Every structure is written in structure tokens, then in C-alpha cells.
Structure 1
Amino acid sequence: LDKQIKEIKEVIELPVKHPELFEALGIAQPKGVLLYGPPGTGKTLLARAVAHHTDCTFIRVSGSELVQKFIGEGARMVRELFVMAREHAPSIIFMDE
């Protein structure tokens, strides 16, 4: 999946490494990626690979209560992960269905 590597590279790598190409173009930096595909076709694989190569902190969100104390003890809201994401920015928050 090389064309897919290329697209994810654009939308993830370029905004965080070269936030000047988008400024010159005059378009807001992309901030949302969604990966179609049957199970085990490389979605999580490519997300992790792009995060690793870009040096972004890959934060996997799954809703498990086993990690709710790590997110925040009184986690009545899912946006409380954003403090962690900001602290470890640049960050890539990955959800899987």
C-alpha cells in the first residue's frame, strides 16, 4: 500500500514538519484522517508507521477503563486526553472500530 503510504504521508508528515507549504497555499492544515478497509489490511500498521517516522507520539484511544486512571482519575469526559496529547505534542490520536 504505497499510494496509501503517500496519502497518509502528505496529510500527517507535511503539516507537522512543513507547516509552510500549507500556509503558502492558503489552506488550513489537515487534521483528520479516516482509513477504510476490511480487518487486518494495514490500517493500524500504517498509522503506527507514519507516527513513528514523523516522531509524533502515537496515542491509541480505545475507551478501555483499564487506562482511565492513566488518562485522568475523574474521567467523565474523553477530551481529558488532550492534556496528555498537548504535553507530548506533536501527537497522533488513533481510534479503531
Structure 2
Amino acid sequence: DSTYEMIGGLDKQIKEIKEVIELPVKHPELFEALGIAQPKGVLLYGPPGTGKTLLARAVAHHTDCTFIRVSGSELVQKFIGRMVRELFVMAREHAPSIIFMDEIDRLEGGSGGDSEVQRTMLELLNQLDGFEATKNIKVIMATNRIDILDSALLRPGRIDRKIEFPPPNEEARLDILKIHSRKMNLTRGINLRKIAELMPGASGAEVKGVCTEAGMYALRERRVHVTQEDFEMAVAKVMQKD
């Protein structure tokens, strides 16, 4: 589900995005007094914020809409489907929907089939740019990895939305790390404040790096509860690759 109880730290950005996404949801009457239309979407460029998808699944979970991705990372690639019209038919039947690519986030064949997917979403943006079947059809890009150059280059911020997202709120390092500590078995004498604030410079992926790279020492010592010293070692275990 990944509701608001599993994502936090972007209060200003959800306060700014409720007018981009939540506008056709609960207050569509401002079309006369304001004169707004359906934009292309929104994207967040920079380091991985450990929850780049939990936000889309969160707003989509509160909008009470379906989540249909394009690349089909989890058994949703051929379930719907020239494999280009079935997505628009399911988008016509299911008017509330949020599209977010996660799997896309050799240069000869990988850019060949990946160039076929890019041409697919380009002609889909041409069909949706020319005509429109129903509302509440918006696409969201993902620029968090290094191999993402087409989405960052083709979206400079001229006819789309752009958000500077290197330093989200420092809660992408602190409070979503606390949330990632709520799921796993957490003790009561831990202080995530210092170990969460003392990881500067490297990247924003310190949450997933310290959790996943700390699971090898919680798997080595076989401790029933995760201690702060495990995360302290995980800081070095993720700073060695820098």
C-alpha cells in the first residue's frame, strides 16, 4: 500500500504537488476561474531518495487509482497487451491512473529495445498530446541513476515541471530511514538522529545502503535486534565504494 504511514519528509513538495496531481481529484471547478489544463507530468532528478516510488504509490494509493507501469518490472509487462494501444484502452477504461517507470531507472541492443520503448512513450506522448480520451492520465519520469539521460535531456523545464532534488529535506536521509527502521525489528535504545545526520557528501541512497549493507552484519552476528553499531559499520561499508 505504502500510505502516508510509510512515506514522509516531502511536506513542502506534496504541498506543491497537490495542485498538479490532486487538482482534478477533489476540486475540478477551477477550470473557469483559473483556466488550467493537463500538463505532461513531473520528475525528480538527482540521487535516489530511497522511496522515489513510494511517493507515486502513496499519492496513487490516496487517490484510489490503479498503478500501471510501462516497463512491467513485476509481472505487469505482458499482462496488459503492437503493444501500444492496449495501454491506451486500459487508460480509457480506468480514467484514474498514475504511470511511473521503475525498471528503466550495451549501447547496441539495450539502446535498441530501449529505444523502441522510448519511441513507444514518444508516440504515446504524441497521441495524448494530439487528442485525449479521459482525464487523470499523467506520466511521471524517473531520473535517479546515471544511465538516465533521455528524460533529463528531453525535459529541461520549458513545457514541463522541474524540481531541484539533491537536498530534498534531509528527511530523505533521516525520517524515511526511521520508516525503513519501523518495518524491520527495531529496538528501543537506538538513536537514528546522529547516525542519520552524519552521512553527508556521498549520496542520498544512505538509507538503502545502510539497511541492505547492514543486513549482512545483522546476518553475520545473527542478532535478534538491530543495534546502532551495525548501522555505524554500514556507514563505512557504503563509504568504501565512494
| Same-fold call, TM cutoff 0.5 | yes
1:96, distance to aligned residue in structure 2 (A): 3.2
Q: How far off its partner does 1:66 sit?
A: 5.2
C-alpha distance after superposition, 1:30-74 (max 9, x if no partner): 34121223124432111111111111222122255954431118x
How many pairs were matched up?
A: 94
- Inter-CA distance 51–45: structure 2 relative to 1 (3 Å threshold): same
* Match status 1:85 vs 2:91: yes
CA RMSD of aligned residues (A): 2.6
Compare 34-43 and 64-73 and name the one that shifted more. Answer: 64-73
Q: Distance in 1 between matches of 2:65 and 2:58?
A: 10
Q: Distance in 1 between matches of 2:64 and 2:76?
A: 23
Runs of 4+ off more than 4 Å: 63-66
How far did residue 8 of structure 1 move? 2.3
2:85 match: secondary structure: helix
- Larger Cα-atom Rg: 2
TM-score where L is the length of structure 2: 0.34
1:26 to 35, 56, 73: 35
SS at match of 1:92: strand
Report if aligned partners of 1:59, 1:92 keep a CA contact under 8 Å in 2. Answer: yes
Greater Cα shift, 6-15 or 31-40: 31-40
CA contact (8 A) 1:37 1:43 kept: no
Q: Does the Cα contact within 8 Å between 1:58 and 1:92 map onto a contact in 2?
A: yes
How far apart are the structure 2 equivalents of 1:34 and 1:23? Answer: 28
Indicate the structure with greater strand content. Answer: 1
CA drift at 1:95: 1.8
Deviation at 1:14, TM superposition (A): 1.1
Preserved CA contact (<8 Å) 1:57 1:89: no
Deviation, structure 1 residue 4: 1.3
Distance across 2 between alignment mates of 1:6 and 1:83: 32
Q: Comparing 24-33 with 42-51, which one deviates more in the overlay?
A: 24-33
SS in 1 for 2:68: strand
Query: Matched residues in 1 for 2:46 and 2:15: separation?
Result: 17
TM-score w.r.t. the length of structure 1 is 0.73
Whether contact under 8 Å (2:67, 2:98) holds in the other structure is yes
Specify the SS of the correspondent of 2:44: strand
Q: Secondary structure at the match of 1:93?
A: strand
* Alpha-carbon distance between aligned partners in 2 of 1:68 and 1:42, rounded to the nearest angstrom: 22
Structure 1 CA distance for aligned equivalents of residues 61 and 79 of structure 2: 22
**Higher helix content, 1 or 2:** 1
